């Protein structure tokens, strides 16, 4: 993915610029399919982020997560909802199955500092689903 | 093309919800 | 689009213009209109309704709509103000008592937004007796110089004599017509 590779450096720079702690409307690109990220797609995205760097060990922030989700949606059309963290306090497992990225403490749950960490077992073990079976349906 | 928003492909379900 | 036909029509004269007749009753409005159209002072009864006529001078057909100065006809000048390009005011210099009423009526008429593009046309009627005022005393009494954004000219005309009608017509044509 040449477009994804090109967007990875700018996205990483924007995320680094944003600290860890104007237009109205909902325009939609014509003919662009929209669907949530798949488990295989989530695993591939996590592997690409780990290989390119800037995702593992980065301080978790709401603005950075939103920027990453928006960049992912722009680049591939994946809904920015699969990059969810498990409920705290503690390590927040990926919300979508197959994701290789998770948020863990780095030190109220909101005041706790979280850092993104790669997790290969997350793509194979539904830790978030097991923790919250009701949330998984 | 067609006025009122072009038709777009739709998925089958939320892949991120398992 | 082409304006060749319009140019051909205007080469020999195409502009007509419009005019209105305003003033108090018994102020020479009917006699003035008869003198302008025909050339003689014809006796007329009270202006219960209105008199409509057209005058052709200098290749311009200026229609004149006489309006009475009666109490029941004074408020009717608003209807005649529609579709009117000119306005002529007939004053009575020999009627000192009616001078204030004429001034009040002129002020009320000139205070209408619709009657804004019409230039001032005041004729010093009854200019045959010693009681008639001059072209400046009547204007000063009526406050013609206080009409902002109004092009008014003072002309004195005698109903019996008819003198000054040509000068007033020339002044009105010069004010309205801005061509050679």
């Amino acid at each position: 993915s040449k477009s994804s590779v090109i967007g990875w450096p700018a996205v990483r720079e924007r995320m680094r610029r944003a600290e860890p702690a104007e237009e109205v409307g909902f325009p939609v690109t014509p003919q662009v399919p929209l669907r949530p990220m798949t488990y295989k797609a989530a695993v591939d995205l996590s592997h690409f982020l780990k290989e390119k760097g800037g995702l593992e060990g980065l301080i978790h922030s709401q603005r950075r997560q939103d920027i990453l989700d928006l960049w992912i949606y722009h680049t591939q059309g994946y809904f920015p909802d699969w990059q969810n963290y498990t409920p705290g306090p503690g390590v927040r497992y990926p919300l979508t199955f197959g994701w290789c990225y998770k948020l863990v403490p780095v030190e109220d749950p909101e005041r706790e500092v979280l850092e993104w960490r790669f997790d290969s077992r997350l793509a194979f073990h539904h830790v978030a689903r097991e923790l919250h079976p009701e949330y998984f349906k | 093309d067609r006025k009122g928003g072009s038709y777009s492909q739709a998925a089958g379900s939320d892949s991120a919800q398992s | 689009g082409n304006i060749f036909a319009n140019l051909f029509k205007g080469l020999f004269g195409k502009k007509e213009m419009r005019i209105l007749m305003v003033g108090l009753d018994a102020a020479g409005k009917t006699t003035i209109l008869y003198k302008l159209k025909l050339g003689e002072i014809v006796t007329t009864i009270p202006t219960i309704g209105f008199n409509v006529e057209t005058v052709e001078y200098k290749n311009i057909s200026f229609t004149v709509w006489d309006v009475g100065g009666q109490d029941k006809i004074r408020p009717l000048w608003r209807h005649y103000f529609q579709n009117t390009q000119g306005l002529i005011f007939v004053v009575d210099s020999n009627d000192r008592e009616r001078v204030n009423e004429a001034r009040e009526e002129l002020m009320r008429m000139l205070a209408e937004d619709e009657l804004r593009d019409a230039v001032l046309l005041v004729f010093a009627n009854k200019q045959d007796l010693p009681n008639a005022m001059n072209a400046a005393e009547i204007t000063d009494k009526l406050g013609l110089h206080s009409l902002r954004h109004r092009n008014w000219y003072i002309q004195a005309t005698c109903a019996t004599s008819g003198d000054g009608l040509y000068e007033g017509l020339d002044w009105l044509s010069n004010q309205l017509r801005n061509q050679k």
Partner: protein, 415 residues
């Protein structure tokens, strides 16, 4: 509990009638016209008429009044639903709603009316089922009606399985003359034109606020529709249990779901109107329109209707963008715009004279409404997640859907 349903005409002549119970004489229809004339002349006209002890409920159709005489205190809502279903069936079978088709397809019309309801109880309500059993150009009744699945006819075979969805958005804004918007409601419409082989069971999935909260994903932009109504084929049990939109899609275009919730966002178009009307001298139309929508969205076929004076004549328009035409039938000036990009600012200056004679009676102040329709814009932000197309045989579907935003009740109170 209507005794008989009949189709009338504008001249009082009944186009067609079909008795169902026989408890009311057919001659009562004649008295309906004088009663309607008296009610209209006295302001007491209502759709539910009453001729003594027999009530003749009538509905104004395109060309005739659908009078449904009744005797007892039957289900008025049921009668209205039956009348609406009959109107829909007639529209489906006959492309024109006038006297031309009433007297042209009477042979099939009588059979359709007989099959629709019996003894005052409607029985047939599927237009496709009615066409498969009653045609204007007979076999045994289809088993789909006898079977539970009456919203998906079995045995349908198609070369391709294509579904055409339509995300219709209706923006209704009730802006008072004081400048404050009172009624600001947005009504969604999920209409899909499903054309595939067989009777697939749709598995609807969208970015709903309730669904996201239930699944724990209540952190993104989720549409929280105040009112959501499922279609006939939609299974209400799944929706009540866990919001599972599982239903058999119909053969053709149908409205599965229709969102309806209040809107708390700024208006897409901000229109400022000025009435510089002189006292029987001239009229001023200081109309300024500001596009509050996103600049990336363009409003195609924008028609902002500005009501002009009833007796106004000789109007002059001084606008910047958009053609302005005064319609004598409409008695108003419509700010017609072909394409209106978001953020556009259009200023108009109307100037026309007025008659010298004053009006005998006042004409009122109708509200000013626009006819903007900007598609490919999702103001509500609700994003469809997936559509579960399941077939027993197994096939790959390619559904399509387009989001269309239009102006609904976007009426601004006149000054």
């Amino acid at each position: 509990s209507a005794s008989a349903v009949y189709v009338l005409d504008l001249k009082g002549k009944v186009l067609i009638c079909r008795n169902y119970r026989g408890d009311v004489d057919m001659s009562e229809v004649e008295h309906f016209m004088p009663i309607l004339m008296e009610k209209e002349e006295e302001g007491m006209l209502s759709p539910i008429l009453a001729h003594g002890g027999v009530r003749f409920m009538w509905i104004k159709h395109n060309n005739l009044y659908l009078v449904a005489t009744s005797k007892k205190n039957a289900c008025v809502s049921l009668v209205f639903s039956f009348l609406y279903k009959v109107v829909q069936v007639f529209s489906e079978y006959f492309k024109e709603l006038e006297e031309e088709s009433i007297r042209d397809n009477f042979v099939i019309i009588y059979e359709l009316l007989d099959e629709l309801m019996d003894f005052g109880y409607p029985q047939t309500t599927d237009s496709k089922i009615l066409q498969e059993y009653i045609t204007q150009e007979a076999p045994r009744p289809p088993a789909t009606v006898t079977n539970a699945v009456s919203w998906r006819s079995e045995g349908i075979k198609y070369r391709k399985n294509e579904v055409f969805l339509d995300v219709i958005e209706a923006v209704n804004l009730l802006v008072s003359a004081n400048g404050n918007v009172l009624r600001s409601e947005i009504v969604g419409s999920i209409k899909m034109r499903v054309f595939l082989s067989g009777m697939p069971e749709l598995r609807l999935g969208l970015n709903d606020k309730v669904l996201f909260d239930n699944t724990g994903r209540g952190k993104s932009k989720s549409v929280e529709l105040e009112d959501v109504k499922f279609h006939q084929c939609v299974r209400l049990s799944r929706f009540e249990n866990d919001r599972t939109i599982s239903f058999i899609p119909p053969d053709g275009e149908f409205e599965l779901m229709s969102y309806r919730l209040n809107t708390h966002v700024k208006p897409l178009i901000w229109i400022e109107s000025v009435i510089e009307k002189h006292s029987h001298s001239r009229i001023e139309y200081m109309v300024k329109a500001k596009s509050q929508f996103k600049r990336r969205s363009t409003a195609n076929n924008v028609e902002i209707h500005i009501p002009v004076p009833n007796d106004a004549d000789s109007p002059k328009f001084k606008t910047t963008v958009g053609s302005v035409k005064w319609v004598p039938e409409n008695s108003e000036i419509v700010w017609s715009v072909k394409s209106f990009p978001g953020g556009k600012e259009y200023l108009m200056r109307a100037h026309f004279g007025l008659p010298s004679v004053e009006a005998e009676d006042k004409e009122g102040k109708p509200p000013i409404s626009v006819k903007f329709e900007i598609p490919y814009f999702t103001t509500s932000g609700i994003q469809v997640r997936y559509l579960k197309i399941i077939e027993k045989s197994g096939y790959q579907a390619l559904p399509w859907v387009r989001y269309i935003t239009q102006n609904g009740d976007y009426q601004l109170r006149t000054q």
